[PDB]
Amino acid sequence: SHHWGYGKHNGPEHWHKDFPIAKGERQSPVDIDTHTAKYDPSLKPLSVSYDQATSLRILNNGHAFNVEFDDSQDKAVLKGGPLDGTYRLIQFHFHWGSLDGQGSEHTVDKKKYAAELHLVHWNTKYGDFGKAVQQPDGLAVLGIFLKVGSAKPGLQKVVDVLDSIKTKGKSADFTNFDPRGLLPESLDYWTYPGSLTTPPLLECVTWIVLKEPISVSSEQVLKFRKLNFNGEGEPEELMVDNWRPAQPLKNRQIKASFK
Ligand SMILES: NS(=O)(=O)c1ccc(NC(=S)Nc2ccc(F)cc2)cc1
Ligand code: NA
Ligand code: NA
Ligand SMILES: [Zn+2]
């Protein structure tokens, strides 16, 4: 069984030994150089259709926490933009720092944000998530930066349940959560082909990274930082700095949806 994480001994610089694709040609995250990304008039309008989203549960997996959705039907889907066809929401999670000056996976002109939200969707032409991650167009991840400032009211229900899932393997019922409350006003975005940012690092993702960050309060992010990577009863290792740094861009171009 694998033992990867974010520490010195098991962090991103070690992942390649068990997961050689770590050094592949389309790894994520990347730095988004805003002066090299080009506006693409071919991109169709982005469609985020979350009205019928059905959240179920929140889980501390020892790496982050996942808010999981019922994806047994097209209840919450992402379409348009660079995407061909229909991508179903399965879960969201975050990456964050020990300090407000770090935490995001993607960077913007080398700027690190305090955190990054990933809304994970799978291409319904492949039938199930497990099949989709074996395809180069299997997933679409909508990435949203978080900066510290004013509180995000739509985040507070997530913050308040974290006390109940402090340690690895703990879960809690998490019904009726509306992920629309985590979006910024603008859907302007950058897009490029990449990968999962954790093991197994599969090169199956179309990344759609929104330009406009959301603002969360210091108190909200402080509560993320009280989570634990460890299991119950084990020595405490605070769940902080669960982000992979930027990877080589290699042959890829980042396209902008906006002028
Ligand atoms: N940070 S991320 O790139 O958005 C990201 C999104 C999703 C996942 N993996 C999930 S949900 N399960 C999974 C399990 C077994 C596999 F073989 C493959 C994937 C990891 C990272
Ligand atoms: Na677009
Ligand atoms: Na915003
Ligand atoms: Zn992620």
Side-chain angles (χ1 to χ4, degrees), residues 2 41-42 64 75 96 133 135 137 188 246 251:
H2 304 285
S42 89
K75 291 183 166 214
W96 62 89
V133 298
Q135 315 304 321
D137 63 348
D188 286 349
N251 184 213

PDB file of all heavy atoms in Angstrom, residues 2 41-42 64 75 96 133 135 137 188 246 251:
ATOM      1  N   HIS A   2       0.475   2.283  -0.670  1.00  0.00           N
ATOM      2  CA  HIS A   2       1.319   3.477  -0.764  1.00  0.00           C
ATOM      3  C   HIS A   2       1.261   4.343   0.487  1.00  0.00           C
ATOM      4  O   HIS A   2       0.287   4.285   1.264  1.00  0.00           O
ATOM      5  CB  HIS A   2       0.967   4.225  -2.021  1.00  0.00           C
ATOM      6  CG  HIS A   2       1.072   3.378  -3.248  1.00  0.00           C
ATOM      7  ND1 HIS A   2       2.286   3.034  -3.816  1.00  0.00           N
ATOM      8  CD2 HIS A   2       0.118   2.794  -4.015  1.00  0.00           C
ATOM      9  CE1 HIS A   2       2.073   2.300  -4.891  1.00  0.00           C
ATOM     10  NE2 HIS A   2       0.767   2.135  -5.032  1.00  0.00           N
ATOM     11  N   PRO A  41     -10.552  32.540 -29.066  1.00  0.00           N
ATOM     12  CA  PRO A  41     -11.967  32.784 -29.460  1.00  0.00           C
ATOM     13  C   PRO A  41     -12.732  31.510 -29.811  1.00  0.00           C
ATOM     14  O   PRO A  41     -13.967  31.527 -29.921  1.00  0.00           O
ATOM     15  CB  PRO A  41     -11.853  33.781 -30.621  1.00  0.00           C
ATOM     16  CG  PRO A  41     -10.490  33.639 -31.138  1.00  0.00           C
ATOM     17  CD  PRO A  41      -9.604  33.188 -29.989  1.00  0.00           C
ATOM     18  N   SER A  42     -12.044  30.392 -29.933  1.00  0.00           N
ATOM     19  CA  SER A  42     -12.739  29.128 -30.212  1.00  0.00           C
ATOM     20  C   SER A  42     -13.419  28.511 -28.978  1.00  0.00           C
ATOM     21  O   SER A  42     -14.232  27.601 -29.105  1.00  0.00           O
ATOM     22  CB  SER A  42     -11.798  28.114 -30.877  1.00  0.00           C
ATOM     23  OG  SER A  42     -11.059  27.277 -29.998  1.00  0.00           O
ATOM     24  N   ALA A  64      -6.659  15.464   2.368  1.00  0.00           N
ATOM     25  CA  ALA A  64      -7.528  16.629   2.360  1.00  0.00           C
ATOM     26  C   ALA A  64      -8.876  16.189   2.913  1.00  0.00           C
ATOM     27  O   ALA A  64      -8.941  15.092   3.495  1.00  0.00           O
ATOM     28  CB  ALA A  64      -7.650  17.197   0.946  1.00  0.00           C
ATOM     29  N   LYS A  75     -26.964  15.185 -12.158  1.00  0.00           N
ATOM     30  CA  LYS A  75     -27.529  16.169 -11.233  1.00  0.00           C
ATOM     31  C   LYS A  75     -26.781  17.486 -11.192  1.00  0.00           C
ATOM     32  O   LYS A  75     -27.363  18.484 -10.912  1.00  0.00           O
ATOM     33  CB  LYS A  75     -27.496  15.580  -9.849  1.00  0.00           C
ATOM     34  CG  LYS A  75     -28.470  14.449  -9.711  1.00  0.00           C
ATOM     35  CD  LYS A  75     -28.454  13.950  -8.296  1.00  0.00           C
ATOM     36  CE  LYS A  75     -29.653  13.070  -8.086  1.00  0.00           C
ATOM     37  NZ  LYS A  75     -30.179  13.199  -6.719  1.00  0.00           N
ATOM     38  N   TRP A  96      -4.363  23.748   0.906  1.00  0.00           N
ATOM     39  CA  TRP A  96      -4.114  24.974   1.635  1.00  0.00           C
ATOM     40  C   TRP A  96      -2.774  24.938   2.335  1.00  0.00           C
ATOM     41  O   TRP A  96      -2.110  23.915   2.412  1.00  0.00           O
ATOM     42  CB  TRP A  96      -5.250  25.276   2.634  1.00  0.00           C
ATOM     43  CG  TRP A  96      -5.431  24.248   3.711  1.00  0.00           C
ATOM     44  CD1 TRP A  96      -4.823  24.214   4.910  1.00  0.00           C
ATOM     45  CD2 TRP A  96      -6.213  23.054   3.617  1.00  0.00           C
ATOM     46  NE1 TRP A  96      -5.226  23.126   5.642  1.00  0.00           N
ATOM     47  CE2 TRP A  96      -6.065  22.367   4.851  1.00  0.00           C
ATOM     48  CE3 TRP A  96      -7.027  22.483   2.633  1.00  0.00           C
ATOM     49  CZ2 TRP A  96      -6.770  21.183   5.139  1.00  0.00           C
ATOM     50  CZ3 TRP A  96      -7.667  21.278   2.923  1.00  0.00           C
ATOM     51  CH2 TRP A  96      -7.550  20.650   4.151  1.00  0.00           C
ATOM     52  N   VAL A 133     -10.778   8.020 -15.438  1.00  0.00           N
ATOM     53  CA  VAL A 133      -9.412   8.425 -15.117  1.00  0.00           C
ATOM     54  C   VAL A 133      -8.342   7.730 -15.964  1.00  0.00           C
ATOM     55  O   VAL A 133      -7.194   8.158 -15.930  1.00  0.00           O
ATOM     56  CB  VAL A 133      -9.045   8.246 -13.653  1.00  0.00           C
ATOM     57  CG1 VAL A 133      -9.930   9.116 -12.783  1.00  0.00           C
ATOM     58  CG2 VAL A 133      -9.059   6.785 -13.179  1.00  0.00           C
ATOM     59  N   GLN A 135      -8.493   7.833 -19.212  1.00  0.00           N
ATOM     60  CA  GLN A 135      -8.631   8.487 -20.520  1.00  0.00           C
ATOM     61  C   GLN A 135      -8.021   9.889 -20.497  1.00  0.00           C
ATOM     62  O   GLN A 135      -8.144  10.591 -19.486  1.00  0.00           O
ATOM     63  CB  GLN A 135     -10.086   8.634 -20.941  1.00  0.00           C
ATOM     64  CG  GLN A 135     -10.948   7.417 -20.745  1.00  0.00           C
ATOM     65  CD  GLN A 135     -10.428   6.244 -21.406  1.00  0.00           C
ATOM     66  OE1 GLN A 135      -9.896   6.293 -22.516  1.00  0.00           O
ATOM     67  NE2 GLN A 135     -10.612   5.081 -20.718  1.00  0.00           N
ATOM     68  N   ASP A 137      -9.103  12.614 -21.748  1.00  0.00           N
ATOM     69  CA  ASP A 137     -10.176  13.551 -21.549  1.00  0.00           C
ATOM     70  C   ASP A 137     -11.205  13.044 -20.555  1.00  0.00           C
ATOM     71  O   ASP A 137     -12.388  13.322 -20.670  1.00  0.00           O
ATOM     72  CB  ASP A 137     -10.819  13.938 -22.874  1.00  0.00           C
ATOM     73  CG  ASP A 137     -11.468  12.795 -23.586  1.00  0.00           C
ATOM     74  OD1 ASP A 137     -11.240  11.622 -23.173  1.00  0.00           O
ATOM     75  OD2 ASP A 137     -12.149  13.057 -24.605  1.00  0.00           O
ATOM     76  N   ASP A 188     -14.585  33.845 -15.984  1.00  0.00           N
ATOM     77  CA  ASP A 188     -13.371  33.943 -16.813  1.00  0.00           C
ATOM     78  C   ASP A 188     -12.349  32.885 -16.312  1.00  0.00           C
ATOM     79  O   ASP A 188     -12.156  32.715 -15.117  1.00  0.00           O
ATOM     80  CB  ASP A 188     -12.730  35.342 -16.736  1.00  0.00           C
ATOM     81  CG  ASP A 188     -13.488  36.456 -17.510  1.00  0.00           C
ATOM     82  OD1 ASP A 188     -14.374  36.147 -18.273  1.00  0.00           O
ATOM     83  OD2 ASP A 188     -13.159  37.605 -17.243  1.00  0.00           O
ATOM     84  N   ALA A 246       4.264  23.740  -8.541  1.00  0.00           N
ATOM     85  CA  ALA A 246       4.178  23.820  -9.990  1.00  0.00           C
ATOM     86  C   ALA A 246       5.190  22.866 -10.673  1.00  0.00           C
ATOM     87  O   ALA A 246       6.372  22.773 -10.253  1.00  0.00           O
ATOM     88  CB  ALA A 246       4.360  25.260 -10.467  1.00  0.00           C
ATOM     89  N   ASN A 251       5.379  20.812 -23.382  1.00  0.00           N
ATOM     90  CA  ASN A 251       4.875  21.242 -24.678  1.00  0.00           C
ATOM     91  C   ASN A 251       3.490  21.984 -24.713  1.00  0.00           C
ATOM     92  O   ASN A 251       3.102  22.564 -25.721  1.00  0.00           O
ATOM     93  CB  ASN A 251       4.971  20.022 -25.606  1.00  0.00           C
ATOM     94  CG  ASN A 251       4.578  20.317 -27.044  1.00  0.00           C
ATOM     95  OD1 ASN A 251       4.026  19.455 -27.740  1.00  0.00           O
ATOM     96  ND2 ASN A 251       4.877  21.528 -27.507  1.00  0.00           N
TER      97      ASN A 251
END
